[PDB]
């Protein structure tokens, strides 16, 4: 059941880059696609993320795109760029200077067909496509527009398979152009309607974690992206190794997902950790639960406090008591029995794998569907009209066609889909 | 002699399929390669074990099965697994894609594309059946296969086998092993749509043998392969009068003779005793008295409820090993005395029994000990109906916020099926309720 | 912490259980239809005991026992007793009664016996020294009543010529230890006995409500322990637990020890408790007959306060532990 | 009580104790519910379709 993973832009190709580091060295494979591991267990569902080439080789099922060759460049000439094909390096020239017209409407334009050339190209070798996974960011202009393009269009051309993201949203603690919030506003009504199950990837709460908890005083976006490697690394255990639940993308986002627009996760890691710096007294099981529902662990900056869970789905990682997993994350839905909604039983899933994290004795990975993930779309919300009404920065978009209504229609979705989260909240 | 098939439906109904034919090959001394030594006509018999294996003129027992899966995964571990050698590969049936969790996609959207080669794989061995009585059918509640295909299934061997007997193995949901939040959407409209086309259905309730596992196994985290093979002994218990010389159960038609008295409410509580340990090799054996009493202790039944709170319809005893008939009569008049068993006015309050001198077999390296005797009880109790009110009431908690009917829809189903499956359950339990007061 | 919903309001008791239990910082209360519960103050009507004892690593126990209904439904106390190999044939404790349905034989068939006898021929539901006057009066309810001789020689406190009944309140926990207060009460009929005209309404049929006088002689019509036995030892030479508690601890043991290989929570997956009512009437002959069982009950006023703690050391902290008695273990 | 209806085997025997006495549808009709829902499966694919045509 394979996945074709798709980066677009700069975010995209950097978290893109980063996750495929950390996979690969978890599989034991190579800069050169070469397997050199101890594990057979390491191969056993690797055709998911991989594609077997010629010699045994192993290449990533992987398409990077961008409308600036700058990024790509450096991945390329990175630590493991060598692994990625080269036909799925599709660039333009002229980039998406921060703009979502520029990436969905004119420069993207250009360019969108030949991705999905290669998107084709993958899937047609694949034995029994499951999905494909995104990342991207929505802030600026090539993974914020022409990502929510390709999504649109790889939906047209395969509407019975799964769309899943990793978006980072946008924050001005962490801020590069003042035109973010109409960008995030714009993708996040194309993810409405477009995408199975999103990861919001805040970079508000990187930052925070990055600058409180890891005492990180001036981090860059290496630090952030190190927590985002690591979140990726977790919500791909069950993908990537064998288990119980026959885990696919589909049953994921059929038991995670009660109403198909509320289908926006919040991320959580567990311990958090710094680069290089290694920790070296492993936690306890009861740390472990106890850490990965505590808001200073969750990559998007929303207090879970402020909302309920309508569906969690938390992930083991190391060897470990898994009578001692279950009796302590029975605990704490017992202690906080109000922040579950108490109309779908048994919401919480656990799943064990064997394997750790290169790094850590034990880990554990946590996925929300949070109700207080609305505090996230308020935040861009308000950023939104703050702008908005009075039409400022407007004309960076008009140039490339837009309308005022097309933003006018955003703000709502948008704000619909606040309010939908709170009628849930209020059960 | 008249040959029974069985069937099994998705991962669960595969696996403990897996587990029953492992071990009827034991107790019928059948080896992973299809050679019976002990049978001496060779390429044909009307012998009892026949009812279960067909033969071949090269001296192979074959089962009487067929394996569907809308997905490889499983299915493929049989091919590749102990007894690959003992099905013919026409009985091995995969999709490339399961039900992801949903009746609707289970029952309609791939359930659509294959029934018809199912069907036309279950006639190949119905056309090796001089007199077919009928079909076991073995599939979980909670998967989209198990529930959206097995009622897709039941509805056609109505159509094309209409008076051949159907029985199920069903299993019904629990937490402890669950692999959906929807498994009560599930359960409820696989059970309304499959009512009238299930003659018998033993429920096996995965808390039940969860517990038993973790209590008489000293098993702190139970596998599925742990749960099987105490499922296997219980299901062996119930077919051993199909595969073996008796007077009781003989054909499929005798379990609703004796278990059902009434169409609907067809699903008896079955009760197995003695559960033991095989590292604890220090064992004191259990007497007839203290196996048959064990019955009526709620922890050793196949579905936790209070009998004493409910009325019985038809109770029957099925031993195995070193027993004989004075003890039992003696350990029933004993029970009877202690114990809260009230009967229905319009059923005779008597006992139905079977005993097998072959003592219960265990599959080597198993966790389940060598006993000396073992009874598997089954009574058609009106307390079994608990286990409705607990899954209906589930359904009644996410159906009341229409939580994640839109992926049942997204398949071509309805909201009124909803509606329809819950009110026949509504109905199931007033049913049970008037006979039960 | 542990967990506990609350599911009957109305419950003068479990009000104050619940009261005490949060003020204990070890336990937390939840929505009533929350199904992470570790205790139950389960209701009155359908208490949904088939979804009891299914919550993963959650030991459940709740305040009510499935099927002793038996007992506290007046139908089926009559038809426990004259069933029960274990109460047959006669237990000499309760007034020879029956069932009588409304549009019956063996009624008849002893009332003439009591009049060509010319026995005490009185009998209750409401009251009447005709047949007639209750069987078309029960045919006027539509609700099934029982039938049942009425004790025409009550005990009778001076002064006042006042007429008594006794409740002992009774706890049973999941253990079925049979744990009775030391403390129970008389509910005194405040005005004087009528003997003969029983038509007076309240003037004989002692009821806390019906008497609305009522809270004259000691306050609410209520004399306690210590003042019923120094009665009884300065007005008739004996103790109250000779006369009369050696044989109410009898009848306790007797019905509760009858239905108990039916209701036993020994090995069940969720374990129970229950608090009980029983009420009493005492003869001249100093003779304790039994009147009803009260599965529902209520305590007095005064000893709210005792009795609701105890029901937490011994029935709930017993299965949830933290960090003299007043009971008596009627042993069995 | 009353021990009734033996019958003795090589390999056991069976019998019956008494204590107390007493006191479909069509492969047509199938299709017209299967391929009815194979239809509002193509309703509202053509109904995305639409909406991605806009
Ligand atoms: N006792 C037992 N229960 C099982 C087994 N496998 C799955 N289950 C239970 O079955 C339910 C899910 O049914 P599955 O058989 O896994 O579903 P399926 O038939 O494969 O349907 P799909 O969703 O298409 O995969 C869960 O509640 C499990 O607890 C098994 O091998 N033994
Ligand atoms: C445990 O996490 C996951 C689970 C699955 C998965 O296939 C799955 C199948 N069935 C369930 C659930 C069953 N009951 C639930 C209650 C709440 C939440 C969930 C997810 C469930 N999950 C897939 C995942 O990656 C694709 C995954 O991430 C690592
Ligand atoms: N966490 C993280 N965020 C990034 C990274 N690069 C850019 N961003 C964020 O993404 C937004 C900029 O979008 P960008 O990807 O550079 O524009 P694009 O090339 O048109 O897709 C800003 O809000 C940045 O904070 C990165 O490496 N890590
Ligand atoms: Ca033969
Ligand atoms: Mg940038
Ligand atoms: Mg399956």
């Given at each position: 059941?394979?996945?074709?993973?798709?980066?677009?832009?700069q975010?995209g190709?950097?978290?893109?880059?980063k996750?495929?580091e950390?996979?690969?060295?978890e599989?034991?494979?190579?800069?050169?696609?070469?397997?050199?591991?101890?594990?057979?267990?390491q191969?056993?569902?690797?055709?998911?993320?991989?594609n077997?080439?010629?010699?045994?080789?192993?290449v990533?099922?992987?398409?990077?795109?961008?409308?600036?060759?700058?990024?790509?460049?450096?991945?390329?000439?990175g630590?493991?760029?060598?692994?990625?094909?080269?036909?799925?390096?599709?660039f333009?020239?002229?980039?998406?200077?921060?703009?979502?017209?520029?990436?969905?409407?004119?420069?993207?334009?250009?360019?969108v067909?030949?991705?999905?050339?290669?998107?084709?190209?993958?899937?047609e070798?694949?034995?029994?496509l499951?999905?494909?996974?995104?990342?991207?960011?929505?802030?600026?202009?090539?993974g914020?527009?022409?990502?929510?393009?390709?999504?649109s269009?790889?939906?047209e051309?395969?509407?019975?398979?799964?769309?899943?993201?990793?978006?980072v949203?946008?924050?001005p603690?962490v801020?590069?152009?003042?035109?973010?919030?109409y960008?995030?506003?714009?993708?996040?009504?194309?993810?409405?309607?477009?995408?199975?199950?999103?990861?919001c990837?805040?970079?508000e709460?990187?930052?925070?974690?990055?600058f409180?908890?890891?005492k990180?005083?001036?981090?860059?976006?290496?630090?952030?992206?190190?927590?985002?490697?690591?979140?990726?690394?977790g919500?791909?255990?069950?993908?990537?190794?064998?288990?119980?639940?026959?885990?696919?993308?589909?049953?994921?986002?059929?038991?995670m997902?009660?109403?198909?627009?509320?289908?926006?996760?919040m991320?959580?890691?567990?311990?958090?950790?710094?680069?290089?710096?290694?920790?070296?007294?492993?936690?306890?099981?009861p740390?472990?639960?106890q850490?990965?529902?505590?808001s200073?662990?969750?990559?998007?900056?929303?207090?879970?406090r402020?909302?309920?869970?309508?569906?969690?789905?938390?992930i083991?990682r190391?060897?470990?008591?898994?009578?001692?997993?279950?009796?302590?994350?029975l605990?704490?839905?017992?202690?906080?029995?109000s922040?579950?909604?108490?109309?779908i039983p048994?919401?919480?899933?656990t799943?064990?794998?064997?394997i750790?994290?290169?790094?850590?004795?034990?880990?554990?990975?946590?996925?929300?569907?949070?109700?207080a993930?609305?505090?996230?779309?308020?935040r861009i919300?308000?950023?939104?009209?703050?702008?908005?009404?009075?039409?400022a920065?407007?004309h960076?978009?008009?140039?490339?066609?837009?309308?005022?209504?097309?933003?006018?229609?955003?703000?709502?979705?948008?704000?619909?889909?606040?309010?939908?989260?709170?009628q849930?909240?209020?059960? | 002699?008249?040959?029974?098939?069985?069937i099994?439906?998705?991962?669960?109904?595969?696996?403990?399929?897996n587990?029953?034919?492992?071990?009827?090959?034991?107790?019928?001394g059948?080896?992973?390669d299809?050679?019976?030594?002990?049978?001496?006509?060779?390429?044909?018999?009307?012998?009892?074990?026949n009812t279960?294996?067909?033969?071949?003129?090269?001296?192979?027992?074959?089962?009487?099965?067929?394996?569907?899966?809308?997905?490889?995964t499983?299915?493929d571990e049989?091919?590749?697994?102990?007894?690959?050698?003992?099905?013919?590969?026409?009985?091995?049936?995969?999709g490339?894609?399961?039900?992801?969790n949903?009746?609707?996609?289970?029952?309609?959207?791939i359930?659509?594309?294959?029934?018809?080669?199912?069907?036309?794989r279950?006639?190949?061995?119905?056309?090796?059946?001089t007199?077919?009585?009928?079909?076991?059918?073995?599939?979980?509640?909670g998967?989209?296969?198990?529930?959206?295909?097995?009622?897709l299934?039941?509805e056609?061997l109505?159509?094309?086998?209409?008076?051949?007997?159907?029985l199920?193995?069903?299993?019904?949901?629990?937490?402890?092993?669950?692999?959906?939040?929807?498994?009560?959407?599930n359960?409820?409209?696989?059970?309304?749509?499959?009512?009238?086309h299930?003659?018998?259905?033993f429920?096996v309730?995965?808390?039940?043998?969860?517990?038993?596992?973790?209590?008489?196994?000293?098993?702190?985290?139970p596998?599925?392969?742990?749960?099987?093979?105490?499922?296997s002994?219980?299901?062996?218990?119930?077919?051993?009068?199909?595969?073996?010389?008796?007077?009781?159960?003989?054909?499929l038609?005798?379990?609703?003779?004796?278990?059902?008295?009434?169409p609907?409410?067809?699903?008896?509580?079955?009760?197995?005793?003695?559960?033991?340990?095989?590292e604890?090799?220090?064992?004191?054996?259990?007497?007839?008295?203290?196996?048959?009493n064990?019955?009526?202790?709620?922890?050793?039944?196949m579905?936790?409820?209070?009998?004493?709170?409910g009325?019985?319809?038809?109770?029957?005893?099925?031993?195995?090993?070193?027993?004989?008939?004075?003890?039992?009569?003696?350990?029933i008049?004993?029970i009877?005395?202690?114990?809260?068993?009230?009967?229905?006015?319009?059923?005779?309050?008597?006992?139905?029994?079977?005993?097998?001198?072959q003592?219960?077999?265990?599959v080597?390296?198993?966790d389940?000990?060598?006993?000396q005797?073992?009874?598997?009880?089954?009574?058609?109790?009106?307390?079994?109906?608990?286990?409705?009110?607990?899954?209906?009431?589930?359904?009644d908690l996410?159906?009341?916020?229409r939580?994640?009917?839109?992926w049942?829809?997204?398949e071509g189903?309805?909201?009124?099926?909803?509606?329809?499956?819950?009110?026949?359950?509504?109905?199931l339990?007033?049913?049970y309720?008037?006979?039960?007061? | 912490m542990?967990?506990?919903?609350?599911?009957?309001?109305?419950?003068?008791?479990?009000?104050?259980?619940?009261?005490?239990?949060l003020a204990?910082?070890?336990?937390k209360?939840?929505?009533?239809?929350?199904?992470r519960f570790?205790?139950?103050?389960?209701?009155?009507?359908?208490?949904?005991?088939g979804?009891?004892?299914?919550?993963?690593?959650?030991?459940?126990?709740?305040?009510?026992?499935?099927?002793?209904?038996?007992?506290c439904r007046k139908?089926?106390?009559?038809?426990?007793?004259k069933?029960?190999?274990?109460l047959?044939?006669?237990?000499?404790?309760?007034?020879?009664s029956?069932?009588?349905?409304?549009?019956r034989?063996?009624?008849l068939?002893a009332?003439?016996?009591?009049?060509e006898?010319?026995?005490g021929?009185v009998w209750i539901?409401?009251?009447?020294?005709?047949?007639?006057?209750?069987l078309?009066?029960?045919?006027?309810?539509?609700?099934?009543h029982?039938?049942?001789?009425?004790?025409?020689?009550?005990?009778?406190?001076?002064?006042?010529h006042?007429?008594?009944?006794?409740?002992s309140?009774?706890?049973?926990?999941?253990?079925?230890?049979?744990?009775?207060?030391?403390?129970?009460?008389?509910?005194?009929?405040?005005?004087?006995?009528?003997?003969?005209?029983?038509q007076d309404?309240?003037?004989?049929?002692?009821?806390?409500?019906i008497?609305?006088?009522?809270?004259?002689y000691?306050?609410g019509?209520?004399?306690?322990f210590?003042?019923?036995?120094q009665y009884?030892?300065?007005?008739?030479?004996?103790?109250?637990?000779?006369?009369?508690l050696?044989?109410?601890?009898?009848?306790?043991?007797?019905?509760?020890?009858?239905?108990?290989?039916?209701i036993?929570?020994?090995?069940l997956?969720?374990?129970?408790?229950?608090?009980?009512?029983?009420?009493?009437?005492?003869?001249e002959?100093?003779?304790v007959?039994?009147?009803?069982?009260?599965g529902?009950?209520?305590?007095?006023?005064?000893?709210?306060?005792?009795?609701?703690?105890?029901?937490?050391?011994?029935?709930?902290?017993?299965?949830?532990?933290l960090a003299?008695?007043?009971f008596?273990?009627?042993?069995? | 009580?009353?021990?009734?209806?033996?019958?003795?085997?090589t390999?056991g025997?069976?019998?019956?104790?008494?204590?107390?006495?007493?006191?479909?549808?069509?492969?047509?009709?199938?299709?017209?519910?299967?391929?009815?829902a194979?239809?509002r499966?193509?309703?509202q694919?053509?109904?995305?379709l639409?909406?991605?045509?806009?």
């Amino acid at each position: 059941r394979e996945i074709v993973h798709i980066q677009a832009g700069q975010c995209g190709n950097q978290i893109g880059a980063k996750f495929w580091e950390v996979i690969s060295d978890e599989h034991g494979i190579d800069p050169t696609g070469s397997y050199h591991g101890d594990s057979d267990l390491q191969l056993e569902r690797i055709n998911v993320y991989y594609n077997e080439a010629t010699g045994n080789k192993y290449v990533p099922r992987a398409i990077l795109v961008d409308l600036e060759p700058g990024t790509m460049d450096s991945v390329r000439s990175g630590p493991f760029g060598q692994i990625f094909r080269p036909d799925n390096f599709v660039f333009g020239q002229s980039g998406a200077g921060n703009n979502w017209a520029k990436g969905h409407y004119t420069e993207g334009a250009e360019l969108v067909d030949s991705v999905l050339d290669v998107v084709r190209k993958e899937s047609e070798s694949c034995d029994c496509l499951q999905g494909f996974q995104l990342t991207h960011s929505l802030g600026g202009g090539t993974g914020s527009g022409m990502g929510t393009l390709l999504i649109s269009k790889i939906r047209e051309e395969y509407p019975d398979r799964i769309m899943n993201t990793f978006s980072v949203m946008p924050s001005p603690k962490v801020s590069d152009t003042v035109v973010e919030p109409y960008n995030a506003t714009l993708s996040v009504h194309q993810l409405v309607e477009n995408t199975d199950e999103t990861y919001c990837i805040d970079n508000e709460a990187l930052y925070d974690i990055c600058f409180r908890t890891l005492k990180l005083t001036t981090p860059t976006y290496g630090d952030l992206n190190h927590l985002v490697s690591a979140t990726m690394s977790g919500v791909t255990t069950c993908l990537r190794f064998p288990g119980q639940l026959n885990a696919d993308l589909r049953k994921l986002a059929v038991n995670m997902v009660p109403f198909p627009r509320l289908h926006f996760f919040m991320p959580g890691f567990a311990p958090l950790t710094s680069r290089g710096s290694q920790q070296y007294r492993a936690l306890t099981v009861p740390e472990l639960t106890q850490q990965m529902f505590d808001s200073k662990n969750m990559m998007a900056a929303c207090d879970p406090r402020h909302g309920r869970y309508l569906t969690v789905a938390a992930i083991f990682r190391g060897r470990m008591s898994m009578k001692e997993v279950d009796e302590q994350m029975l605990n704490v839905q017992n202690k906080n029995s109000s922040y579950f909604v108490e109309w779908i039983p048994n919401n919480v899933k656990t799943a064990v794998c064997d394997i750790p994290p290169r790094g850590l004795k034990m880990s554990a990975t946590f996925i929300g569907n949070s109700t207080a993930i609305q505090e996230l779309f308020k935040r861009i919300s308000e950023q939104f009209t703050a702008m908005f009404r009075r039409k400022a920065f407007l004309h960076w978009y008009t140039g490339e066609g837009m309308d005022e209504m097309e933003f006018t229609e955003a703000e709502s979705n948008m704000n619909d889909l606040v309010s939908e989260y709170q009628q849930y909240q209020d059960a | 002699m008249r040959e029974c098939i069985s069937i099994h439906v998705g991962q669960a109904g595969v696996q403990i399929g897996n587990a029953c034919w492992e071990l009827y090959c034991l107790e019928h001394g059948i080896q992973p390669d299809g050679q019976m030594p002990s049978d001496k006509t060779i390429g044909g018999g009307d012998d009892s074990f026949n009812t279960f294996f067909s033969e071949t003129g090269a001296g192979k027992h074959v089962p009487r099965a067929v394996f569907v899966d809308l997905e490889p995964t499983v299915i493929d571990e049989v091919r590749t697994g102990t007894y690959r050698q003992l099905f013919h590969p026409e009985q091995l049936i995969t999709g490339k894609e399961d039900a992801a969790n949903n009746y609707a996609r289970g029952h309609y959207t791939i359930g659509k594309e294959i029934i018809d080669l199912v069907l036309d794989r279950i006639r190949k061995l119905a056309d090796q059946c001089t007199g077919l009585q009928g079909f076991l059918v073995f599939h979980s509640f909670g998967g989209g296969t198990g529930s959206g295909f097995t009622s897709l299934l039941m509805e056609r061997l109505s159509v094309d086998y209409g008076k051949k007997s159907k029985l199920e193995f069903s299993i019904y949901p629990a937490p402890q092993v669950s692999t959906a939040v929807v498994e009560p959407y599930n359960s409820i409209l696989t059970t309304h749509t499959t009512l009238e086309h299930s003659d018998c259905a033993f429920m096996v309730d995965n808390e039940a043998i969860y517990d038993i596992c973790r209590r008489n196994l000293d098993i702190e985290r139970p596998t599925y392969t742990n749960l099987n093979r105490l499922i296997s002994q219980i299901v062996s218990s119930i077919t051993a009068s199909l595969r073996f010389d008796g007077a009781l159960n003989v054909d499929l038609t005798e379990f609703q003779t004796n278990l059902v008295p009434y169409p609907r409410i067809h699903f008896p509580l079955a009760t197995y005793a003695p559960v033991i340990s095989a590292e604890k090799a220090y064992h004191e054996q259990l007497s007839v008295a203290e196996i048959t009493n064990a019955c009526f202790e709620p922890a050793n039944q196949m579905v936790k409820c209070d009998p004493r709170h409910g009325k019985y319809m038809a109770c029957c005893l099925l031993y195995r090993g070193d027993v004989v008939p004075k003890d039992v009569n003696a350990a029933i008049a004993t029970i009877k005395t202690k114990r809260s068993i009230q009967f229905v006015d319009w059923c005779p309050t008597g006992f139905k029994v079977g005993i097998n001198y072959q003592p219960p077999t265990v599959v080597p390296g198993g966790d389940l000990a060598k006993v000396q005797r073992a009874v598997c009880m089954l009574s058609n109790t009106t307390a079994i109906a608990e286990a409705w009110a607990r899954l209906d009431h589930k359904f009644d908690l996410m159906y009341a916020k229409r939580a994640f009917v839109h992926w049942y829809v997204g398949e071509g189903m309805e909201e009124g099926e909803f509606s329809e499956a819950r009110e026949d359950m509504a109905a199931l339990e007033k049913d049970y309720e008037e006979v039960g007061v | 912490m542990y967990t506990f919903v609350v599911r009957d309001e109305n419950s003068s008791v479990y009000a104050e259980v619940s009261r005490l239990l949060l003020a204990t910082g070890q336990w937390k209360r939840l929505r009533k239809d929350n199904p992470r519960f570790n205790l139950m103050l389960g209701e009155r009507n359908r208490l949904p005991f088939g979804r009891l004892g299914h919550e993963p690593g959650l030991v459940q126990l709740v305040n009510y026992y499935r099927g002793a209904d038996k007992l506290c439904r007046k139908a089926s106390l009559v038809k426990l007793i004259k069933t029960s190999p274990e109460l047959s044939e006669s237990c000499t404790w309760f007034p020879e009664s029956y069932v009588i349905y409304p549009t019956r034989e063996v009624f008849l068939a002893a009332y003439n016996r009591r009049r060509e006898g010319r026995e005490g021929n009185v009998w209750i539901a409401l009251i009447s020294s005709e047949a007639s006057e209750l069987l078309d009066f029960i045919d006027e309810q539509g609700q099934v009543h029982v039938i049942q001789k009425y004790l025409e020689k009550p005990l009778l406190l001076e002064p006042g010529h006042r007429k008594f009944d006794i409740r002992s309140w009774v706890l049973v926990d999941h253990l079925y230890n049979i744990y009775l207060y030391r403390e129970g009460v008389l509910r005194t009929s405040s005005e004087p006995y009528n003997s003969a005209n029983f038509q007076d309404k309240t003037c004989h049929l002692t009821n806390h409500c019906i008497q609305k006088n009522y809270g004259r002689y000691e306050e609410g019509n209520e004399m306690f322990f210590e003042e019923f036995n120094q009665y009884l030892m300065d007005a008739l030479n004996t103790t109250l637990e000779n006369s009369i508690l050696l044989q109410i601890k009898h009848i306790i043991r007797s019905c509760l020890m009858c239905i108990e290989p039916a209701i036993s929570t020994k090995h069940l997956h969720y374990q129970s408790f229950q608090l009980f009512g029983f009420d009493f009437m005492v003869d001249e002959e100093l003779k304790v007959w039994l009147i009803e069982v009260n599965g529902a009950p209520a305590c007095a006023q005064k000893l709210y306060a005792e009795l609701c703690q105890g029901i937490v050391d011994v029935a709930i902290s017993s299965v949830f532990p933290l960090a003299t008695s007043i009971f008596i273990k009627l042993h069995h | 009580m009353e021990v009734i209806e033996l019958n003795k085997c090589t390999s056991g025997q069976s019998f019956e104790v008494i204590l107390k006495p007493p006191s479909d549808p069509s492969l047509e009709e199938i299709q017209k519910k299967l391929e009815a829902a194979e239809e509002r499966r193509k309703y509202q694919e053509a109904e995305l379709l639409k909406h991605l045509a806009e």
